[PDB]
Amino acid sequence: NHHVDYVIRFNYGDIDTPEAIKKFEVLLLELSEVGLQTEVRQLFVFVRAASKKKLKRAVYQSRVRDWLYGVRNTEPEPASSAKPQSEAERLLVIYHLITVPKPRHGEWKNVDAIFPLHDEETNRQCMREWSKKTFLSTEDLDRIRNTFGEHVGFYFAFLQSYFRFLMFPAAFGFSCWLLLGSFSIIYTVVNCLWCIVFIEYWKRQEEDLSCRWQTKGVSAVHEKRAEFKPEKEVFPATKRMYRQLLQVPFALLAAVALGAIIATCFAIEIFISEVYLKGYLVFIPTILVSALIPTMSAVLLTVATKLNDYENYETQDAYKVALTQKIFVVNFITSYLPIILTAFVYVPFASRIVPYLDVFHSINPDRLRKQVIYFTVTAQIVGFALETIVPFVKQRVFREYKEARFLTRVRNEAELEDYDVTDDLREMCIQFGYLALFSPVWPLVPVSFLINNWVELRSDFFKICVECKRPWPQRADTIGPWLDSLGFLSWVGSITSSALVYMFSNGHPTTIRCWALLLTIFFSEHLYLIVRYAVRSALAKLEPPNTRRERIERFMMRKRYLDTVLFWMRQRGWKESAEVGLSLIT
Amino acid sequence: NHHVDYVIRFNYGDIDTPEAIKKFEVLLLELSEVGLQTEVRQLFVFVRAASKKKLKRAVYQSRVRDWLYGVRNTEPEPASSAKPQSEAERLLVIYHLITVPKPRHGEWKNVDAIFPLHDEETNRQCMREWSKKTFLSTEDLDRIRNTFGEHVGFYFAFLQSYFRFLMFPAAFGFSCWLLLGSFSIIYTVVNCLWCIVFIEYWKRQEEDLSCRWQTKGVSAVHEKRAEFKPEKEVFPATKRMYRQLLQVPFALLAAVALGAIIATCFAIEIFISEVYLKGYLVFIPTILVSALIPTMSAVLLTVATKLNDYENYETQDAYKVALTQKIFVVNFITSYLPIILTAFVYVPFASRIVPYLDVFHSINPDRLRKQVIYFTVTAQIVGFALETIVPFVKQRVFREYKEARFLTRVRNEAELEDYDVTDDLREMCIQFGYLALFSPVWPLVPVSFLINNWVELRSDFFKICVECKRPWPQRADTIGPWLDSLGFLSWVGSITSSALVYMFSNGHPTTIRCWALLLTIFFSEHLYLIVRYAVRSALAKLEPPNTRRERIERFMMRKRYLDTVLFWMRQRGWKESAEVGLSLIT
Numbered sequence A, B: 001n002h003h004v005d006y007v008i009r010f011n012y013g014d015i016d017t018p019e020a021i022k023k024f025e026v027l028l029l030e031l032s033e034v035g036l037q038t039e040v041r042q043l044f045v046f047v048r049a050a051s052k053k054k055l056k057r058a059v060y061q062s063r064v065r066d067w068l069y070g071v072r073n074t075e076p077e078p079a080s081s082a083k084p085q086s087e088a089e090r091l092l093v094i095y096h097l098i099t100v101p102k103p104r105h106g107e108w109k110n111v112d113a114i115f116p117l118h119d120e121e122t123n124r125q126c127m128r129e130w131s132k133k134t135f136l137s138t139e140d141l142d143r144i145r146n147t148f149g150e151h152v153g154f155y156f157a158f159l160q161s162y163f164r165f166l167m168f169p170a171a172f173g174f175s176c177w178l179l180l181g182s183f184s185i186i187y188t189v190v191n192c193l194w195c196i197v198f199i200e201y202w203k204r205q206e207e208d209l210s211c212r213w214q215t216k217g218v219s220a221v222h223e224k225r226a227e228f229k230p231e232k233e234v235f236p237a238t239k240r241m242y243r244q245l246l247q248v249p250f251a252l253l254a255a256v257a258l259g260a261i262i263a264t265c266f267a268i269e270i271f272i273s274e275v276y277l278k279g280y281l282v283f284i285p286t287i288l289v290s291a292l293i294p295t296m297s298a299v300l301l302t303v304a305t306k307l308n309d310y311e312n313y314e315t316q317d318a319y320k321v322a323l324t325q326k327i328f329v330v331n332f333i334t335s336y337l338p339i340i341l342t343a344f345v346y347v348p349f350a351s352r353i354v355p356y357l358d359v360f361h362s363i364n365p366d367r368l369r370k371q372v373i374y375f376t377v378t379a380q381i382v383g384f385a386l387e388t389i390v391p392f393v394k395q396r397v398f399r400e401y402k403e404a405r406f407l408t409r410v411r412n413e414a415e416l417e418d419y420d421v422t423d424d425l426r427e428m429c430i431q432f433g434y435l436a437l438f439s440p441v442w443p444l445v446p447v448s449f450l451i452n453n454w455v456e457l458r459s460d461f462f463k464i465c466v467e468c469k470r471p472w473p474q475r476a477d478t479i480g481p482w483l484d485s486l487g488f489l490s491w492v493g494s495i496t497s498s499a500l501v502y503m504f505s506n507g508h509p510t511t512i513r514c515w516a517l518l519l520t521i522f523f524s525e526h527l528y529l530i531v532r533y534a535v536r537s538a539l540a541k542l543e544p545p546n547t548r549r550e551r552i553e554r555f556m557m558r559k560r561y562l563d564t565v566l567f568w569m570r571q572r573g574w575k576e577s578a579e580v581g582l583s584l585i586t
C-alpha cells in the first residue's frame, strides 16, 4: 500500500559513460509508456503506473487481447469501468507492460532482475488462520489466486488435492501393517488402483480450476529466437525433430554416468557389509555419494542447458518444459536406483557374485527395511531443514554483516532468492514415487507423507512469504510437464510393485522366472493398462460444472453477435390430398 | 433434377379408419412446415421444399444454429443471399426439417422409412473417370462430399489414405519374400513401425478433412430418452456407469460361447488330420463353423441390442457407437481365434495332448501357411462375391417376378437396402488386422490388400450407386469408434508378431519360456509403447495448414465483434532523473 509495483536494479560493472547511456535509454522507454519511474540510488528504481486513465486503458487493452485469442471468452467490460478485480492482476499487466518488445531482464542490460514486493500485513495474517483448520478452503485458495499469480495457485491446488486423497491409503496401510504382515496382495491392489484414480481426478480437476480462474494459456511471449525465416504477416519446425533427435543420447549418457556412480557407491557398502575407524569407514560410501552426484548432476544441468538452447525456441513456456524433462531423467535415476539395486540384484542373487570384490582396496534381510525408512521418512526431515531453516539463518546472519524505512526494507528484499514453483514441485513428484514404487515395503509410508504434506503445505507457503522474493504473477492452465510425467511414474509402479510382491512371497534361482516372475508382470501390468482405460474414459463423461458453464457462456456470447449485428406436381397442397388419401380403400 | 427430395412409404397393416387419421396427421405437420407433399398411391408421397423464400430461410436457419454452437465458426451469410453451396447440403436441411420434433421414421408411425434418390446421369459418369486413374484426387473427393453426405466422405478418405500407404509395406514384403525367407526380424520391425505411423497420420488427418469440410459434430438429435428428470431450462449420468458396469460380463459371455465353438470346430479338424466319404468328412467342421457362428453371433447382436437400449441414451451418434463396440468383441473373436489356435497351441505343443480325443465319435508344418492364405486372399474373393454380386442378381431376378417412368423407377428404388458405412467399414478394420497380427507368415500379404483396396474402393462406390438406396447426408467429425479401436488392434500385434518370430526362429518345451518367450514380449511390446509416444507427440507439433487456418479464422471473427460493437514520489518524471542518474559517479 505504498504506491509501488516493481524494482529494477543495476550492475556497476562498466565505465561511467555508457552506464549513463544505458540507464536513460531504458528510462526513456518507460518514459514513453509507464511514467513516474522514481529512483533512489541503492542503483534501483521504483516503477508505478502513472495515470489511472492510462491504467484503465491498459487493463482493458490486456482484457481485449486476452479475449480475442479465445481465453477470456466473455464480453470484455469497456474501458470506462474496468476494475482490476484483483491485486496481482493489476500487477500482472505492468509486467507485460515492461517486459514486452515494441527491456530484457536477465540479459542484454545491466539489470540483474525485476521484482515486486510483499504485503507483510496480510502475509502475517494468512498463516495464522489456516494454521488452525484441518485443510483450507476455496475462499482461502482464491486469496492465493488474487495474489501470487495463478501458476502458484495450481501448486497449492495440486498439493491440497494430493493431501485430502492421502487420507485413503494412509488409513488403509494403517490396517495391513496392523492386520497382515507386509507384502499383502490386498495392499498392493489398493495401492495401484488408488494411483490411477488420483491422476484422472486431477486431469479432470485442472479443467475446472483453470476454467474457474479464466485461463487457457496459449500465448505467452517470444524471445531470443533469431527467426531464421523472417515474415511480418518463420522457421521449419521439422528441424526441431532433427534436434530433438539429438535429445535421445543425452538420457543414456546420464544413465551411463550416474547409474555407474551410484552402483559403484552401492558396491562398496556391501563390501564393508562383508569384510567389516571401521565404523568410520562405514560412512565413506554415504560420504562418496553425498559429494559426487550433487556435483555430477550439476554438470548434467549444464549439458541439458547447452542442449536446450540449440533451437530457435519461439515460446516462453516450453523452455520451462524442455529444461524440466531433461532434468527429470537425472532425478529419476538419482532417487530410485538406490532402492532398485537393493531390491532387484541384492536379495534375489548377487550372493552368487559376492566373491567378486576389490581385494586391492550371507544375505542381510533388513537392507530394504532400513533404506526405505531412510528415504521416505528421514530425508523429508532433513529436507525440511535444508529447504527452510538453512536459508533463514542465512537471511538473518548475513543481514548483520552488511521515511527511510523502505530502503531498509527493499535492500533486504534484494538479498533473497526468486521462487520457483517447479523446483519445489519436483520434490513432490519424486516423493509421489516412493508411494508408487515401494509402498509394499513397510506400508506405513502414506502416513509419512500425510503428516508431511500437512506441514509441507504450511511451510512452503511460509517459504514464499519471507524467505524468498515475491514471484511475479505468471499464468498457466496446467502444472506443466509434471502431469504427463506423473502417469509414466505410476505406470512403472505397476511393474515393480507387482514383481516385488511375488519375490517376497514368504521367503527368498530360488523362485521360478518362467512360471511366476514374468506372467505376474504381464498379467498385472496389462491389467493396470485397461483400468486406466476404464476410468479415464469414465470421468470424461461425468462433465464437471464449470466447463459446462464455460461452454454455455461461449454459446450465449455468440447469441449476441448474431443478434446485435442481425414439374407436374399439382395436388394444390392439402385439399386434393384428401381425395387421393381416400384411395386407401382398395 | 425432377423437383423431388424424399419419399415416405407406408404400412397397409391396419384398418382403414386410423390409417386415414394417421396419414393426414403427419401430412398436416408437413403442411405446417414443408408444403407440396405430392403423393402417388404406390402408398408413398414425394416431399419438396415449397417456396424458395422458405428454402432460403431454413438454410440460413441451419447455418445460424450450425454457427453459434461453435462448428461453422465463421460469419453466416445473411438470409438474402444464402446459396446452398452443394446438393446434399440442400438435401440435408430437409431431413432435419422433417425428422425433428416440435415424424419418427422407424417407429411409432406406419412408415417403413424415408429415402432420397440418386442422380443416374452423374453416377454413371463418376465411375468411368476414376476407374482410369492411379488413385483419385481431392477434386473427386469433394464430389463425394457435395453428394453422399460427409460421413461417407470420411470412408473413402480413410480408404484412400489406407490405399496410398499400403504401397510401402507391399513393396517391402515383396523384398523379404524374395530376398530372405519368412519370419525375418527385419520384416516384423518394418511391419510394426509402419502401423504406428499410419494411425498417427490418420489421427492428424481427420483434423484436416473435418476442418476442410466445416464440421465438428457435437449436436445431432435426442430420441426415445424418456427424460427421467424433466427440465425445460435431466438424468443422473452416473447410472450410465452403473449400467456400463453390466456391459463387462457380456464380453466374457461372448468369449465363453464363441471361443468354445470355434475351438470345438478346431478340435475336430485335427482329429481327422490324424484319424484320416473320408474326404467328404473333411468338409464337416468347415460346414459346422459356417452355419453355427453366423447364427450364434446373430443371437449375440440381439443381446447387445437388448443391452444397448437399457439407458435413457440422450444422443443419436453414441448408439451407433455403443452398438459398434459391443458388436466388435464378437468380430475380434470370430475372425482371429481361428489363426491363434493354429499358432499358439497347435505347433508349440498339443502334440502332447493329441492322444486326448473322441473315440466315441506328427505335426503338419503347413497348417499356418494354408489357413492364412484362406483368410487374407481367398476370403476377400468370396467376400467380393457375397457383398456385390449376390444382391445384384437378387435385384434383377426379383425385379422380374413382380410420365409413369418415375413409378417404374421409384418402386425399384424401394426394393434395395439402406447403406451402412459402419457395416462396410468393419470389413476394413478387420482386414487391417491380418496385416497387423499375421503378416510374418507369408509376407506377400500387404500386396493382397493393395490389389484388393484398389478394387474395393471402386466396388464399394459402385455398391452405393445402384445396389442399395441413397444414404441421407449424415455429418461426422471422425470415423466413429473405429479410430480408437484400431490402435488397440495394432497394440496386440506388437505382442503376437514379436512372439511369432521367436517361436519359428529356424525350427520348433522345445524353446525356452524363461529366457526368450517373455523377455522378447516385454522388451518389444514396451518398445512399441514408447515409439507410439514419440510419433504421437511429434506429429502434433507439426500443425497442418487447415487447423491453423481455422484458428486464424476464429481470431479474425472475434476482431469484428470487438470492432463493430466497439505518496512521496517527486522526481517530476524525466528531467530530475538526469541529476539523480548523474549520481552514478560515486
Ligand SMILES: [Ca+2]
Binding pocket: A383, A384, A387, A427, A456
Ligand atoms: Ca520440503
Ligand SMILES: [Ca+2]
Binding pocket: A387, A424, A456, A459, A460
Ligand atoms: Ca517443501
Ligand SMILES: [Ca+2]
Binding pocket: B383, B384, B387, B427, B456
Ligand atoms: Ca468387400
Ligand SMILES: [Ca+2]
Binding pocket: B387, B424, B456, B459, B460
Ligand atoms: Ca467392399
